[PDB]
Paper text:
To better understand the CARD domain-mediated inhibition mechanism of ARC during apoptosis signaling, we report the first crystal structure of the CARD domain of ARC containing amino acids 1–95 at a resolution of 2.4 Å. The high resolution structure of ARC CARD showed that it comprises five helices, H1 to H5, which is not the typical fold of the DD superfamily. Interestingly, the sixth helix (H6) was not detected at the typical location, indicating that H6 might be flexible in the CARD domain of ARC or adopt a loop structure instead. There were two monomers in the asymmetric unit, chain A and chain B. The model of chain A was built from residue 5 to residue 87 and residue 91 to residue 93, while that of chain B was built from residue 5 to residue 84. The helix bundle from H1 to H5 was tightly packed by a central hydrophobic core composed of I12, V20, L23, L30, L31, L34, L35, L40, L48, V58, L61, L62, L64, V65, L76, and L77. The two ARC CARDs in the asymmetric unit are packed as an asymmetric dimer with an interface composed primarily of an electrostatic interaction. The principal interaction forces are salt bridges and hydrogen bonds, which are made by D13 (on H1), R56 (on H4), R59 (on H4), and R60 (H4) from chain A and by D32 (on H2), R37 (on H2), E46 (on H3), and D49 (on H3) from chain B. Although a unique disulfide bond-mediated homo-dimeric structure of the CARD domain including NOD1 and CARMA1 has been reported, the current structure of ARC CARD was dimerized via a Type I interface, which is a novel method for the homo-dimeric CARD structure. The size exclusion chromatography and MALS experiment showed that the dimeric ARC CARD became a monomer via mutations of interface residue D49R, R56E, and R59E, and double mutants.
Apoptosis repressor with caspase recruiting domain (ARC) is a multifunctional modulator of apoptosis. Human ARC contains 208 amino acids and is composed of two distinct domains, N-terminal caspase recruiting domain (CARD) domain and C-terminal P/E (proline and glutamic acid) rich domain. ARC is a unique apoptosis inhibitor in that it can antagonize both the intrinsic and extrinsic pathways. ARC CARD interacts directly with the death domains (DD) of Fas and FADD, as well as with the death effector domains (DEDs) of procaspase-829.
Author numbering: 5 to 86, 91 to 95
The structure:
Amino acid sequence: QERPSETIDRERMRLVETLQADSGLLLDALLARGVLTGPEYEALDALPDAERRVRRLLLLVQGKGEAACQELLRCAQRTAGAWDWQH
């Protein structure tokens, strides 16, 4: 069905809204899983704007492909959680 990168594209607003408060922890979780490099993680951790921080993480992760996207979503949903109106 839906590719992880497509999930991120469709849920971009919700992810950006629900992940801001704990974006540091998310960065940490993703560094510890190899999804981010050290420099990537520093660059993102240093952004003072937490919304832009999440927005850029999402883009960075979409650019790395589907596995990276899955990893972000699995970490995301631990803090943010996972009707049929699209039909």
